[PDB]
Amino acid sequence: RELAILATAENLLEDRPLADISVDDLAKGAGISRPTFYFYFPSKEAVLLTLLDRVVNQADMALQTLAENPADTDRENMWRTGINVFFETFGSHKAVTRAGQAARATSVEVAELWSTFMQKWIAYTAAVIDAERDRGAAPRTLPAHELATALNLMNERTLFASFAGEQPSVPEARVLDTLVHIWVTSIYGE
Amino acid sequence: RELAILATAENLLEDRPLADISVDDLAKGAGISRPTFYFYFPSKEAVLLTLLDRVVNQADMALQTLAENPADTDRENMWRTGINVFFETFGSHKAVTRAGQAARATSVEVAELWSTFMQKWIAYTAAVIDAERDRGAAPRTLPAHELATALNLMNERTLFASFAGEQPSVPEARVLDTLVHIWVTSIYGE
Ligand SMILES: CC(C)CCCc1nc(-c2ccc(C(=O)NCCC(F)(F)F)cc2)cs1
Ligand SMILES: CC(C)CCCc1nc(-c2ccc(C(=O)NCCC(F)(F)F)cc2)cs1
């Protein structure tokens, strides 16, 4: 029934914002009553937090999997496989992505979740840049953590604008190539 | 008295969010009554829209001024002078920047203002990249408008995270050099 509430919420978020979804809407979709809903989640806000937590951990575990089983390809394709984790994971859950980013403004728990994982993904990015510099493949230009931070924030803004069809945005079918170019040139360029 | 209302609002936004500022707060600061406030602005939301409109046009007119009077320096310093318009203009009005970005979620007029100017700044960016390619200084890699869009969105997210001291963020004293590196490598890199 927890899974039914979560699937109901993800389905309804494709049609309307969390503000237009009632606890009664979530309960009906999961085949339970309102007070029975409160046995599983304290609020509709907690439901979105759990949905975002699932998608964020999905992306994180995919990047951990790549990290353990390196692809046998050139540096451009290495970075492309990493960015693609986020493109495919968040782009496969557009309504949770959209609603979760909007909740950053109003939910300390959402803001803290997003902050925690971005710090982790930025640290990992910087560690890989540092490894590329140590082996002589990348030049020692900017501080690696500072470069990693700007590239990770570029991807957050640019992928999510693309998925939402914002004006302006890179077309979704061009956004991966766009970001790979900017990561590879900025990491390997003198 | 319009200028007094606007100065009052900019001052109060340094201490608290627009949600915690009342029309009565703005009126008191400008030395007028509540109904007299409504003679100048329909809402506190319109006051923020005007503040954001002023800062956005300040940045736009600064970039127009640079465009007319080119600086006599290398390509890295050219791009640095352009990014610096946004760093100095928005970084000199941090409370309006913060409040204006937050209002994008709730105000169609704010969202449309921000969208309109980003389109203009992206078009100008793409026109300069195209000129650099035409003269043989930049290689024909990505579509220039797509590259321009991702670089402009990177700057929006990265400058505003820096000004807000978000975790994560590039330190404010490093953010200009960080962005200049990524623009120059991605625009001139093969
Ligand atoms: C083959 C193995 C060793 C992977 C090596 C390539 C790597 N890629 C990354 C990386 C991290 C973050 C993001 C990124 O997109 N952040 C932003 C996340 C989001 F959601 F905000 F967009 C994109 C790539 C780090 S190392
Ligand atoms: C010497 C003359 C000819 C200027 C040539 C250098 C140029 N610089 C730009 C440019 C445009 C936008 C931004 C930019 O930061 N956008 C994002 C704005 C904001 F506010 F969202 F951060 C940054 C530089 C375009 S051509």
Curated annotation (Swiss-Prot), chains A, B:
Residues at the site labelled Inhibitor-binding: 152, 155
Domain named HTH tetR-type: residues: 1-59
Residue range(s) of DNA binding per entry: 22-41
One Gene Ontology biological process: negative regulation of DNA-templated transcription
A cellular component annotation (GO) from this entry: cytosol
InterPro entries documented for this protein: EthR_C (IPR049397), Homeodomain-like_sf (IPR009057), HTH-type_TetR-like_transc_reg (IPR050109), HTH_TetR (IPR001647), Tet_transcr_reg_TetR-rel_C_sf (IPR036271)
Activity regulation (UniProt): Inhibited by tert-butyl 4-(3-thiophen-2-yl-1,2,4-oxadiazol-5-yl) piperidine-1-carboxylate (RF1) and 1-(thiophen-2-ylacetyl)-4-(3-thiophen-2-yl-1,2,4-oxadiazol-5-yl)piperidine (RF3).
Keyword hit for Transcription regulation: yes
Disruption phenotype: Cells lacking this gene leads to ETH hypersentivity.
Entry keyword set: DNA-binding, Repressor, Transcription, Transcription regulation
Function recorded in the entry: Involved in the repression of the monooxygenase EthA which is responsible of the formation of the active metabolite of ethionamide (ETH).
PANTHER family: HTH-TYPE TRANSCRIPTIONAL REGULATOR ETHR, HTH-TYPE TRANSCRIPTIONAL REGULATOR RUTR
Protein name per its UniProtKB record: HTH-type transcriptional regulator EthR
